[PDB]
Structures are given as C-alpha cells and as structure tokens.
Design a protein around this ligand. Structure first.
Ligand code: BGC
Ligand code: BGC
Ligand code: BGC
Length: 125
C-alpha cells in the first residue's frame, strides 16, 4: 500500500518523467514524479505505479525503462531484493537488474549483475 521514492548511485531520485519517453535517475529531490506505489503482484513480485497511474516496465531490456503501461503483466513485475546495507535492487522478468546508469543515460533493465548503479536507497514517502 506504500508510496516510496528511490535514490540512485548518483544521489538523484528515480523519475517517472510522467510517462513521456524514458525514466531517468535525475531529480534533485523526490516530488510527485519520483513517487511510486509498491504493488503486491503475487508470489513475492512487485509492480510500481507512477504519478500518472501507469506502471513501470522493464521493456525487456530492449529500450530504456518506461512508466506508461495501463496494466500490469509480464514485463511489469519485479523481484524486490533486500541488500545487506539496507538498499534495494529490482530484478526484471528477463533476469536483469534495474540500473540508474549513474544518471548518464536513461534507466535500463539489461545488466545481469548488481553493482553500484543497480542499488537504490529507498523510503516510504
Ligand atoms: O512536481 C512534479 C514534477 O515536476 C517536474 O517538473 C519535475 O521534473 C519532477 O521531478 C517533479 O516530480
Ligand atoms: O502476465 C504475467 C504477470 O501477470 C501479473 O498479473 C502477475 O501478477 C505476475 O506475477 C505475472 O508474471
Ligand atoms: O506480455 C509481455 C509483455 O509484452 C509487451 O509487448 C508489453 O509491452 C508488456 O507490457 C508485456 O508485459
């Protein structure tokens, strides 16, 4: 039921970009576009509903990640990985990890391992 924000390796916050184009980890402070409702999608999987009421997609790693899907299936469910330092990682349905890409390009879900860029600090809004 909880609304959260996600802070990437570069200290900026994950931004839905209002469903226009790709998501970026580029905002200074968490505001409306940086808030995501965590959705229990069944069997330990989660989805994320953005400010626009649409759902985050891995895009199967074929393009940068987006927040424009009107319904959850799948590319829209993720494993919520709880890391030892209290950070979170997200694993898409293709087995790859959501990456802030250090804010140098739009967010992706095509990297097979958790490194610095794939670990997010988070908090309930
Ligand atoms: O306040 C709503 C949104 O406005 C946009 O102009 C900013 O880029 C977002 O970071 C913010 O969440
Ligand atoms: O379409 C596949 C997906 O559909 C969703 O409605 C389920 O909750 C997911 O766990 C499933 O992988
Ligand atoms: O059905 C698997 C996936 O197919 C894609 O074409 C859709 O854009 C995704 O939203 C969906 O989860």
């Amino acid at each position: 039921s909880k609304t959260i924000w996600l802070q990437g390796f570069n200290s900026k916050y994950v931004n839905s970009r209002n469903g226009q184009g790709a998501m970026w980890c580029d905002s200074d402070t968490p505001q409306a576009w940086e808030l995501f409702t965590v959705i229990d999608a069944g069997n330990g999987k989660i989805a994320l509903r953005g400010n626009n009421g649409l759902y985050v997609s891995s895009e199967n790693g074929e393009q940068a990640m987006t927040c424009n899907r009107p319904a959850i299936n799948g590319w829209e469910v993720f494993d919520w990985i709880s890391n030892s330092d209290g950070s979170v990682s997200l694993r898409g349905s293709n087995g790859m990890y959501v990456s802030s890409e250090n804010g140098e390009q739009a967010i992706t879900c095509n990297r097979p391992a958790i490194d610095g860029w794939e670990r997010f600090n988070w908090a309930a809004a």
